């Protein structure tokens, strides 16, 4: 059908059809008369997977032969989503498979909808890791993603009576055709025990052993025949574990619980023992695998020339003391040499400045679980603080501020400080965030070692986030500038010369309109909900958090509602306001916010005076596969965190690539997006970081806004009085109390400007041609936000390797 | 190479080779330069499995079309062993695969040794189920085996310092290529809850739900293209189970523990809740599947014409009240009609008369776990006892003896009584056992319903237990009488006309000698143990139990040792005495017996005066794959249980088929074996059942034997004094005390006759030609003990279906 989707040659189509029937028969053990759509999905998945394995084997053979520097990306989260369509896109097989399945009497889109998301992440950090893997393969890097194979990923969200309920995400129930178990490369990981000092160094003994079994998933580059590996570890008990007899076998679950479930917190630290075990488990198994591969080429001098380890936040920070442990205790390098190697190997990426998100582990935990690592951390701290004291003599407060050990009620280890000390590079994830790190929380470290600190602005992969989810848009773009932009996103600037082209203006707008129709039909089909497809689709999809300010959006929605009720017969630009995202199960305020959103919907959506001029929909179970549907359908992207809180954001970039305009604060990557497109082509409002700091110095008093803004006071009175909860008038008292007395994110302070800016949005939407022209200017300048750009910078500035766009042979 | 192993045609060999390379590449994702022998094993297994699926699909299609009566064999145990060689044998692929692998540079035997046993059974009962499945497929019956897919089967036995240690049998670690998960046919099973009575009958409510997920394994018939199904259930938690959040996910293990581990008791009842859950789980999932299949053809009148359910002992006895539950509560049949259907559908097989093995469940357990089933059982009991009272008026003691409810300290349900009441046929497993049932423990039931009681003497499959494990013997036999005997074992009688044939005598003896050499080499290779291959191989392999009297064997071994030490320069027929088998982990006396065996070995094997005239070897980790090695190598089969205790035995039959002579008591199937071969061709000794009864009436006094038999007294003094445990002189005090004061199995009473009979064995072994002639007479009359004969009798006399030897089309 469409050009970007590749060739459908007779030979290939014939071959695909026979391999599909072969898998249906021999692999699935079904005949056509009993096969369900799920059986068909699996036959297709195995058929496409067969095309990966050849290139996978020869890629890994190639790295063995040529022995390039290897990049190891260590993350506790990989939010992969679905694999089938991505694999087809990257192998140029989509049209052929479409043809082959069509000829067998099947709709491929329908089969694609059967695949479960691999939901092994919470949101942006996990999804960034997934985008990065795709870019690293596309750029020809010898890269491996290492993580944990959770049996249960991020929970499935149901809404019952307006409240979030959580269900286990049993994503492996029907099997995962993409992975390959590798039980032959199982590795032991140690816990507990004690340290023994001998004539010849320390020994960690009397440990409990848990086995780490790997599962490998292929990661195909874009049409270059590179297939890299994501290796995920699964916990297994040894066979003599606890070895009355029956109970000892049942107690194997204790050991195997390490890989059972993903902690469902986004931007929050929960200091539980099981989480610490997960962090050490991934680190200890991964480092043995790295060292094995390195030896299979005594001289650890060359280790940093052949290995880079990238720490995705502090979650795998134990890599630093584990590497020292291995080098000093097992390989018997002297301390100084070991530390040099470690520092040159490791680099650390920070993704947040929120204090409740920073990992600070109680010493008593590490002492019990990882007694040798604690000794090593203490030794690192002592030597690091000696360097500080020599650079800043007599500055005793600096010593206590920079220490890896925090004193207080309970002593804790600051994992961010450990990561800075033991890494040759530290980066933030957008220019403003990186500056904030140097100015505030890591200021002392920056003064000591300015050369360590860098920026690497985040990006998203244009394979998944344009070609795959928005083929219509990719096509009309390819018609004008060709296909090269898919792996060189800066070529989208060529689109600026079509900004006055009436044909292009029309096609851009038609593609959006079709995306909106298809999403509106999705809603009815799957959720019995009826929306006006001519309305402005105003969307805020991201995890539920106070700092992301879903509440500020809610205040606007109610304002629109009240203005309609005040002047019902006055014209307003119709909107469909969509908000979605998951709340962490223990985050009470987030759960209340969800309930508020549905409650506003209950009132607004059933008010005859409103009509279809305003609809408020809570999008259930937001996840990668839903993002690929709603993002191409959006007109307005809500990126409204308090300035200084959203380290980067990545949803923002997805919307910009897909033809939505952005309303947002000058926060995270929003600043660079506005800079790339021009501020005139962005709806910017609110306090800058400097204004927030000024307000904090003065003292934020919310009462003042309530007193001076009647529209705001009215909303608060509606909330308190039970207008949105008739049967339980005090239901939202916690929300009102927070907004009025302890709002850390200053919702009221940005209200007036937000509402005004939203009026300017409605004004522009009334003039379709000018809206579309501004859209074209956004799409055209979105190139900087390709993760290919991001990974090229990591590669050159941190890892010391050159990317390559050269194909390997097929 | 050999004829019985099938054709190695150029086309087939070429095809096998390409499919092997295809699986190595696409299935295993390996290249030849990294592949290990395990990868090669898996490539072969997938290649052979491909040849099954076609016939599997068309067999099951065929049963759908023709709708024959279906046979459901319900067992908690299926002791399958290895699958690869069996599958090749049954498909006529062995020589082709041998050729194909040879041409790829691989030894197929070596690859066969990599496969794990499926050890989902304890011993004879589980292995009988496996033999039965093979025969039912070979005889063309529409049969399904239903059980539990245990994650851990029977434990791996290690011997440390002469003591048994248990290790978990993680048999699924590397994957199981033979099974196919069928998550689409997952079924709910209910536990706990309470019963509600309405206007319209009882309702079982507030239950906890556990899901039953099936896994299907193919069961190929012998060269008839029939492939039947063994469906094994795995426990899964529902996704809203327990649904703070993390703990709720981790607590899914509670539900999933049901299918975690096989209870490792042979002939012993352990009344634990988890075991009861396993029993109900298999029954409840299986019966829904049966009823689904029956409806997919309102009229339950025809249910017994289309369904037979065979209960493998009482372990699945809850099928009876579950069937009533479904018919009465869900389908709303009246009680009397439901009971008629149930009785005509169910048949019960008893496998033991040992009182400690009989299942008697505490009412309080059933009351909590299965409250509706308890109500149904009470109702069955009341109506059954009304029939008893009407047939035997005023016989109040009969009423209490026959009740399903046992009164006492705790009230219990007698599951054997439930099974007799609710089955149209009840059988024992050898003629003497079946008579014992009618005379003793089920006498009252036999008087009430004599027509129910039958015999079905056990058998073993001659595919696994001759062709597969002893190809050399199968060949020399096929040279004379052709190949038809493999599926018509009675044809072995034709061998009686070769009893005076000097060529045949020589070939039989050479085959044995080669089996012995190959087993002696196995021992060195794998266990650094050096044995004389010219010695008589005297073997006792079976589970360790007091009733099997491994101790009587030990007493003989020590007698031989003492006689040598008394007259060292006198000639004796050299023996290698081999004893193997597992002890249940909680069975203290069994564990002591193992230690005694190794301790005797420690003394005997290192005594220079003995030389290589006597060796005592404990065979570690006895299991199906070890049985296939040691049984073809044996000269003497020890079948020495106390008369009346071994219901049948099946090991006995395996040895007879493979050219060993038997020393044994008149117990179980030994009686029929002696009858078939002629008593002159059997080494029978000891009390008959009648003599045991006489001794029990008088009172067994062990002291009397000790007083009158000096050789016995000497052994007991050696045991007590620490001769076999120098460092711990009192180590075997428990054993001595049991033998002297509370030996339920009368070891001393058979000692004199056992020793005398063993002298007659040694005398015959000194004359090779006459030994071999007696062997030929055993092999030639072993035909009755084919499980094909057994299953034909079940089919005609219990299930009401005719077997067929007709092939389906390939
Ligand atoms: O750089 C990728 C994205 O990381 C997110 C993030 N920052 N910290 C976490 C986090 C912290 C603890 C647990 C799980 C996730 N997630 C940030 O909040 C986003 O601004 C950013 O785009
Ligand atoms: O008929 C097959 C074989 O069943 C065995 C047997 N009888 N009861 C059990 C049993 C009882 C409880 C748990 C596990 C197995 N096993 C008998 O002891 C054997 O004589 C018999 O050959
Ligand atoms: C991109 C993405 C996110 C991150 O969105 P932000 O708006 O940057 O928080 C979270 N969840 C999913 C499923 C995504 O695809
Ligand atoms: C046949 C067999 C048994 C049963 O042997 P008996 O001597 O009848 O108890 C037990 N275990 C295994 C592994 C077998 O093959």
JSON list of C-alpha atoms in Angstrom, two decimals, chain B residues 465-626:
[
{"chain": "B", "resi": 465, "resn": "UNK", "atom": "CA", "xyz": [11.49, -52.57, 28.32]},
{"chain": "B", "resi": 466, "resn": "UNK", "atom": "CA", "xyz": [12.97, -54.72, 25.56]},
{"chain": "B", "resi": 467, "resn": "UNK", "atom": "CA", "xyz": [13.49, -53.01, 22.19]},
{"chain": "B", "resi": 468, "resn": "UNK", "atom": "CA", "xyz": [14.64, -49.70, 23.59]},
{"chain": "B", "resi": 469, "resn": "UNK", "atom": "CA", "xyz": [16.79, -50.85, 26.48]},
{"chain": "B", "resi": 470, "resn": "UNK", "atom": "CA", "xyz": [18.04, -54.19, 25.11]},
{"chain": "B", "resi": 471, "resn": "UNK", "atom": "CA", "xyz": [18.35, -53.91, 21.30]},
{"chain": "B", "resi": 472, "resn": "UNK", "atom": "CA", "xyz": [20.85, -56.79, 21.17]},
{"chain": "B", "resi": 473, "resn": "UNK", "atom": "CA", "xyz": [18.34, -59.19, 22.64]},
{"chain": "B", "resi": 474, "resn": "UNK", "atom": "CA", "xyz": [15.47, -57.88, 20.55]},
{"chain": "B", "resi": 475, "resn": "UNK", "atom": "CA", "xyz": [17.60, -58.49, 17.43]},
{"chain": "B", "resi": 476, "resn": "UNK", "atom": "CA", "xyz": [18.65, -62.11, 18.03]},
{"chain": "B", "resi": 477, "resn": "UNK", "atom": "CA", "xyz": [15.01, -62.81, 18.84]},
{"chain": "B", "resi": 478, "resn": "UNK", "atom": "CA", "xyz": [13.81, -61.09, 15.67]},
{"chain": "B", "resi": 479, "resn": "UNK", "atom": "CA", "xyz": [16.33, -63.10, 13.62]},
{"chain": "B", "resi": 480, "resn": "UNK", "atom": "CA", "xyz": [14.40, -66.28, 14.48]},
{"chain": "B", "resi": 481, "resn": "UNK", "atom": "CA", "xyz": [10.75, -65.33, 14.83]},
{"chain": "B", "resi": 482, "resn": "UNK", "atom": "CA", "xyz": [10.49, -61.96, 13.04]},
{"chain": "B", "resi": 483, "resn": "UNK", "atom": "CA", "xyz": [9.31, -58.61, 14.41]},
{"chain": "B", "resi": 484, "resn": "UNK", "atom": "CA", "xyz": [5.64, -59.19, 15.16]},
{"chain": "B", "resi": 485, "resn": "UNK", "atom": "CA", "xyz": [6.33, -60.08, 18.79]},
{"chain": "B", "resi": 486, "resn": "UNK", "atom": "CA", "xyz": [7.04, -56.43, 19.63]},
{"chain": "B", "resi": 487, "resn": "UNK", "atom": "CA", "xyz": [3.30, -55.75, 19.55]},
{"chain": "B", "resi": 488, "resn": "UNK", "atom": "CA", "xyz": [2.17, -59.34, 20.20]},
{"chain": "B", "resi": 489, "resn": "UNK", "atom": "CA", "xyz": [4.38, -60.52, 23.00]},
{"chain": "B", "resi": 490, "resn": "UNK", "atom": "CA", "xyz": [2.82, -64.02, 23.24]},
{"chain": "B", "resi": 491, "resn": "UNK", "atom": "CA", "xyz": [4.79, -64.87, 20.08]},
{"chain": "B", "resi": 492, "resn": "UNK", "atom": "CA", "xyz": [7.84, -65.22, 22.33]},
{"chain": "B", "resi": 493, "resn": "UNK", "atom": "CA", "xyz": [6.56, -68.77, 23.12]},
{"chain": "B", "resi": 494, "resn": "UNK", "atom": "CA", "xyz": [7.94, -69.71, 19.68]},
{"chain": "B", "resi": 495, "resn": "UNK", "atom": "CA", "xyz": [11.32, -69.40, 21.38]},
{"chain": "B", "resi": 496, "resn": "UNK", "atom": "CA", "xyz": [10.79, -72.66, 23.29]},
{"chain": "B", "resi": 497, "resn": "UNK", "atom": "CA", "xyz": [11.74, -74.55, 20.11]},
{"chain": "B", "resi": 498, "resn": "UNK", "atom": "CA", "xyz": [15.25, -73.00, 20.30]},
{"chain": "B", "resi": 499, "resn": "UNK", "atom": "CA", "xyz": [15.94, -74.11, 23.85]},
{"chain": "B", "resi": 500, "resn": "UNK", "atom": "CA", "xyz": [18.19, -76.94, 22.55]},
{"chain": "B", "resi": 501, "resn": "UNK", "atom": "CA", "xyz": [19.64, -74.79, 19.70]},
{"chain": "B", "resi": 502, "resn": "UNK", "atom": "CA", "xyz": [23.35, -74.33, 20.33]},
{"chain": "B", "resi": 503, "resn": "UNK", "atom": "CA", "xyz": [23.56, -71.16, 18.21]},
{"chain": "B", "resi": 504, "resn": "UNK", "atom": "CA", "xyz": [20.70, -69.48, 20.11]},
{"chain": "B", "resi": 505, "resn": "UNK", "atom": "CA", "xyz": [22.10, -70.54, 23.50]},
{"chain": "B", "resi": 506, "resn": "UNK", "atom": "CA", "xyz": [25.39, -68.88, 22.53]},
{"chain": "B", "resi": 507, "resn": "UNK", "atom": "CA", "xyz": [23.75, -65.66, 21.24]},
{"chain": "B", "resi": 508, "resn": "UNK", "atom": "CA", "xyz": [21.53, -65.23, 24.36]},
{"chain": "B", "resi": 509, "resn": "UNK", "atom": "CA", "xyz": [24.63, -65.62, 26.55]},
{"chain": "B", "resi": 510, "resn": "UNK", "atom": "CA", "xyz": [26.75, -63.28, 24.42]},
{"chain": "B", "resi": 511, "resn": "UNK", "atom": "CA", "xyz": [24.05, -60.55, 24.56]},
{"chain": "B", "resi": 512, "resn": "UNK", "atom": "CA", "xyz": [24.01, -60.80, 28.37]},
{"chain": "B", "resi": 513, "resn": "UNK", "atom": "CA", "xyz": [27.80, -60.69, 28.54]},
{"chain": "B", "resi": 514, "resn": "UNK", "atom": "CA", "xyz": [27.90, -57.58, 26.36]},
{"chain": "B", "resi": 515, "resn": "UNK", "atom": "CA", "xyz": [25.19, -55.88, 28.50]},
{"chain": "B", "resi": 516, "resn": "UNK", "atom": "CA", "xyz": [27.26, -56.65, 31.59]},
{"chain": "B", "resi": 517, "resn": "UNK", "atom": "CA", "xyz": [30.46, -55.24, 30.03]},
{"chain": "B", "resi": 518, "resn": "UNK", "atom": "CA", "xyz": [28.70, -52.06, 28.96]},
{"chain": "B", "resi": 519, "resn": "UNK", "atom": "CA", "xyz": [27.18, -51.60, 32.45]},
{"chain": "B", "resi": 520, "resn": "UNK", "atom": "CA", "xyz": [30.53, -52.29, 34.15]},
{"chain": "B", "resi": 521, "resn": "UNK", "atom": "CA", "xyz": [32.08, -49.58, 31.97]},
{"chain": "B", "resi": 522, "resn": "UNK", "atom": "CA", "xyz": [29.20, -47.23, 32.87]},
{"chain": "B", "resi": 523, "resn": "UNK", "atom": "CA", "xyz": [30.06, -47.73, 36.53]},
{"chain": "B", "resi": 524, "resn": "UNK", "atom": "CA", "xyz": [33.74, -46.80, 36.15]},
{"chain": "B", "resi": 525, "resn": "UNK", "atom": "CA", "xyz": [33.10, -43.85, 33.76]},
{"chain": "B", "resi": 526, "resn": "UNK", "atom": "CA", "xyz": [30.43, -42.25, 35.91]},
{"chain": "B", "resi": 527, "resn": "UNK", "atom": "CA", "xyz": [31.16, -43.46, 39.48]},
{"chain": "B", "resi": 528, "resn": "UNK", "atom": "CA", "xyz": [34.84, -44.56, 39.73]},
{"chain": "B", "resi": 529, "resn": "UNK", "atom": "CA", "xyz": [33.83, -48.10, 40.78]},
{"chain": "B", "resi": 530, "resn": "UNK", "atom": "CA", "xyz": [35.58, -51.30, 39.59]},
{"chain": "B", "resi": 531, "resn": "UNK", "atom": "CA", "xyz": [33.59, -54.55, 39.17]},
{"chain": "B", "resi": 532, "resn": "UNK", "atom": "CA", "xyz": [34.30, -58.07, 37.89]},
{"chain": "B", "resi": 533, "resn": "UNK", "atom": "CA", "xyz": [32.17, -58.60, 34.76]},
{"chain": "B", "resi": 534, "resn": "UNK", "atom": "CA", "xyz": [32.46, -62.41, 35.09]},
{"chain": "B", "resi": 535, "resn": "UNK", "atom": "CA", "xyz": [30.63, -62.35, 38.42]},
{"chain": "B", "resi": 536, "resn": "UNK", "atom": "CA", "xyz": [26.96, -63.14, 38.86]},
{"chain": "B", "resi": 537, "resn": "UNK", "atom": "CA", "xyz": [25.13, -59.74, 38.81]},
{"chain": "B", "resi": 538, "resn": "UNK", "atom": "CA", "xyz": [22.69, -60.12, 41.71]},
{"chain": "B", "resi": 539, "resn": "UNK", "atom": "CA", "xyz": [20.37, -57.10, 41.70]},
{"chain": "B", "resi": 540, "resn": "UNK", "atom": "CA", "xyz": [17.65, -55.57, 43.83]},
{"chain": "B", "resi": 541, "resn": "UNK", "atom": "CA", "xyz": [16.42, -52.25, 42.50]},
{"chain": "B", "resi": 542, "resn": "UNK", "atom": "CA", "xyz": [13.15, -50.77, 43.77]},
{"chain": "B", "resi": 543, "resn": "UNK", "atom": "CA", "xyz": [12.08, -48.20, 46.35]},
{"chain": "B", "resi": 544, "resn": "UNK", "atom": "CA", "xyz": [13.50, -48.74, 49.84]},
{"chain": "B", "resi": 545, "resn": "UNK", "atom": "CA", "xyz": [10.78, -50.13, 52.09]},
{"chain": "B", "resi": 546, "resn": "UNK", "atom": "CA", "xyz": [10.59, -52.54, 55.02]},
{"chain": "B", "resi": 547, "resn": "UNK", "atom": "CA", "xyz": [8.06, -54.72, 53.16]},
{"chain": "B", "resi": 548, "resn": "UNK", "atom": "CA", "xyz": [10.39, -55.13, 50.15]},
{"chain": "B", "resi": 549, "resn": "UNK", "atom": "CA", "xyz": [12.99, -56.59, 52.58]},
{"chain": "B", "resi": 550, "resn": "UNK", "atom": "CA", "xyz": [16.24, -55.12, 51.29]},
{"chain": "B", "resi": 551, "resn": "UNK", "atom": "CA", "xyz": [17.28, -56.14, 54.85]},
{"chain": "B", "resi": 552, "resn": "UNK", "atom": "CA", "xyz": [16.81, -59.84, 54.09]},
{"chain": "B", "resi": 553, "resn": "UNK", "atom": "CA", "xyz": [19.20, -59.33, 51.14]},
{"chain": "B", "resi": 554, "resn": "UNK", "atom": "CA", "xyz": [21.67, -57.64, 53.47]},
{"chain": "B", "resi": 555, "resn": "UNK", "atom": "CA", "xyz": [21.53, -60.60, 55.83]},
{"chain": "B", "resi": 556, "resn": "UNK", "atom": "CA", "xyz": [22.47, -62.92, 52.94]},
{"chain": "B", "resi": 557, "resn": "UNK", "atom": "CA", "xyz": [25.35, -60.68, 51.82]},
{"chain": "B", "resi": 558, "resn": "UNK", "atom": "CA", "xyz": [26.85, -60.74, 55.32]},
{"chain": "B", "resi": 559, "resn": "UNK", "atom": "CA", "xyz": [26.35, -64.52, 55.49]},
{"chain": "B", "resi": 560, "resn": "UNK", "atom": "CA", "xyz": [28.39, -64.88, 52.26]},
{"chain": "B", "resi": 561, "resn": "UNK", "atom": "CA", "xyz": [31.07, -62.60, 53.69]},
{"chain": "B", "resi": 562, "resn": "UNK", "atom": "CA", "xyz": [31.28, -64.56, 56.97]},
{"chain": "B", "resi": 563, "resn": "UNK", "atom": "CA", "xyz": [31.46, -67.91, 55.12]},
{"chain": "B", "resi": 564, "resn": "UNK", "atom": "CA", "xyz": [34.36, -66.60, 53.00]},
{"chain": "B", "resi": 565, "resn": "UNK", "atom": "CA", "xyz": [36.20, -65.34, 56.08]},
{"chain": "B", "resi": 566, "resn": "UNK", "atom": "CA", "xyz": [35.71, -68.74, 57.76]},
{"chain": "B", "resi": 567, "resn": "UNK", "atom": "CA", "xyz": [37.07, -70.72, 54.74]},
{"chain": "B", "resi": 568, "resn": "UNK", "atom": "CA", "xyz": [38.98, -68.20, 52.60]},
{"chain": "B", "resi": 569, "resn": "UNK", "atom": "CA", "xyz": [40.65, -70.73, 50.30]},
{"chain": "B", "resi": 570, "resn": "UNK", "atom": "CA", "xyz": [37.40, -72.49, 49.35]},
{"chain": "B", "resi": 571, "resn": "UNK", "atom": "CA", "xyz": [35.82, -71.74, 45.94]},
{"chain": "B", "resi": 572, "resn": "UNK", "atom": "CA", "xyz": [32.64, -69.67, 45.69]},
{"chain": "B", "resi": 573, "resn": "UNK", "atom": "CA", "xyz": [30.78, -68.36, 42.67]},
{"chain": "B", "resi": 574, "resn": "UNK", "atom": "CA", "xyz": [31.80, -64.68, 42.50]},
{"chain": "B", "resi": 575, "resn": "UNK", "atom": "CA", "xyz": [28.97, -62.15, 42.88]},
{"chain": "B", "resi": 576, "resn": "UNK", "atom": "CA", "xyz": [28.42, -58.50, 42.41]},
{"chain": "B", "resi": 577, "resn": "UNK", "atom": "CA", "xyz": [25.53, -57.58, 44.65]},
{"chain": "B", "resi": 578, "resn": "UNK", "atom": "CA", "xyz": [23.80, -54.40, 43.56]},
{"chain": "B", "resi": 579, "resn": "UNK", "atom": "CA", "xyz": [21.09, -52.70, 45.52]},
{"chain": "B", "resi": 580, "resn": "UNK", "atom": "CA", "xyz": [19.47, -49.41, 44.62]},
{"chain": "B", "resi": 581, "resn": "UNK", "atom": "CA", "xyz": [16.46, -47.26, 45.25]},
{"chain": "B", "resi": 582, "resn": "UNK", "atom": "CA", "xyz": [15.25, -44.10, 46.94]},
{"chain": "B", "resi": 583, "resn": "UNK", "atom": "CA", "xyz": [13.94, -43.73, 50.50]},
{"chain": "B", "resi": 584, "resn": "UNK", "atom": "CA", "xyz": [11.10, -41.32, 51.20]},
{"chain": "B", "resi": 585, "resn": "UNK", "atom": "CA", "xyz": [12.72, -38.30, 52.99]},
{"chain": "B", "resi": 586, "resn": "UNK", "atom": "CA", "xyz": [10.72, -38.78, 56.21]},
{"chain": "B", "resi": 587, "resn": "UNK", "atom": "CA", "xyz": [11.07, -42.57, 56.39]},
{"chain": "B", "resi": 588, "resn": "UNK", "atom": "CA", "xyz": [13.74, -42.98, 59.02]},
{"chain": "B", "resi": 589, "resn": "UNK", "atom": "CA", "xyz": [14.06, -46.81, 58.87]},
{"chain": "B", "resi": 590, "resn": "UNK", "atom": "CA", "xyz": [14.50, -46.67, 55.04]},
{"chain": "B", "resi": 591, "resn": "UNK", "atom": "CA", "xyz": [17.25, -44.14, 55.43]},
{"chain": "B", "resi": 592, "resn": "UNK", "atom": "CA", "xyz": [18.99, -46.36, 58.00]},
{"chain": "B", "resi": 593, "resn": "UNK", "atom": "CA", "xyz": [18.78, -49.33, 55.58]},
{"chain": "B", "resi": 594, "resn": "UNK", "atom": "CA", "xyz": [20.60, -47.37, 52.89]},
{"chain": "B", "resi": 595, "resn": "UNK", "atom": "CA", "xyz": [23.33, -46.54, 55.39]},
{"chain": "B", "resi": 596, "resn": "UNK", "atom": "CA", "xyz": [23.61, -50.22, 56.37]},
{"chain": "B", "resi": 597, "resn": "UNK", "atom": "CA", "xyz": [24.04, -51.22, 52.72]},
{"chain": "B", "resi": 598, "resn": "UNK", "atom": "CA", "xyz": [26.86, -48.74, 52.13]},
{"chain": "B", "resi": 599, "resn": "UNK", "atom": "CA", "xyz": [28.45, -49.74, 55.47]},
{"chain": "B", "resi": 600, "resn": "UNK", "atom": "CA", "xyz": [28.50, -53.44, 54.50]},
{"chain": "B", "resi": 601, "resn": "UNK", "atom": "CA", "xyz": [30.09, -52.32, 51.23]},
{"chain": "B", "resi": 602, "resn": "UNK", "atom": "CA", "xyz": [32.74, -50.34, 53.13]},
{"chain": "B", "resi": 603, "resn": "UNK", "atom": "CA", "xyz": [33.82, -53.51, 54.93]},
{"chain": "B", "resi": 604, "resn": "UNK", "atom": "CA", "xyz": [33.33, -56.13, 52.23]},
{"chain": "B", "resi": 605, "resn": "UNK", "atom": "CA", "xyz": [34.79, -54.24, 49.29]},
{"chain": "B", "resi": 606, "resn": "UNK", "atom": "CA", "xyz": [38.09, -53.45, 51.01]},
{"chain": "B", "resi": 607, "resn": "UNK", "atom": "CA", "xyz": [38.81, -56.83, 52.60]},
{"chain": "B", "resi": 608, "resn": "UNK", "atom": "CA", "xyz": [41.85, -58.32, 50.81]},
{"chain": "B", "resi": 609, "resn": "UNK", "atom": "CA", "xyz": [40.83, -61.87, 51.70]},
{"chain": "B", "resi": 610, "resn": "UNK", "atom": "CA", "xyz": [37.57, -61.45, 49.76]},
{"chain": "B", "resi": 611, "resn": "UNK", "atom": "CA", "xyz": [39.27, -60.25, 46.58]},
{"chain": "B", "resi": 612, "resn": "UNK", "atom": "CA", "xyz": [36.89, -59.78, 43.68]},
{"chain": "B", "resi": 613, "resn": "UNK", "atom": "CA", "xyz": [34.75, -62.71, 44.84]},
{"chain": "B", "resi": 614, "resn": "UNK", "atom": "CA", "xyz": [32.16, -60.45, 46.51]},
{"chain": "B", "resi": 615, "resn": "UNK", "atom": "CA", "xyz": [31.34, -56.81, 45.83]},
{"chain": "B", "resi": 616, "resn": "UNK", "atom": "CA", "xyz": [28.46, -54.80, 47.29]},
{"chain": "B", "resi": 617, "resn": "UNK", "atom": "CA", "xyz": [27.46, -51.68, 45.35]},
{"chain": "B", "resi": 618, "resn": "UNK", "atom": "CA", "xyz": [24.70, -49.24, 46.23]},
{"chain": "B", "resi": 619, "resn": "UNK", "atom": "CA", "xyz": [23.35, -47.86, 42.96]},
{"chain": "B", "resi": 620, "resn": "UNK", "atom": "CA", "xyz": [22.80, -44.15, 43.43]},
{"chain": "B", "resi": 621, "resn": "UNK", "atom": "CA", "xyz": [19.74, -42.30, 42.14]},
{"chain": "B", "resi": 622, "resn": "UNK", "atom": "CA", "xyz": [17.76, -45.27, 40.79]},
{"chain": "B", "resi": 623, "resn": "UNK", "atom": "CA", "xyz": [15.19, -44.01, 38.30]},
{"chain": "B", "resi": 624, "resn": "UNK", "atom": "CA", "xyz": [13.75, -45.04, 34.90]},
{"chain": "B", "resi": 625, "resn": "UNK", "atom": "CA", "xyz": [16.87, -44.17, 32.85]},
{"chain": "B", "resi": 626, "resn": "UNK", "atom": "CA", "xyz": [19.10, -46.19, 35.28]}
]
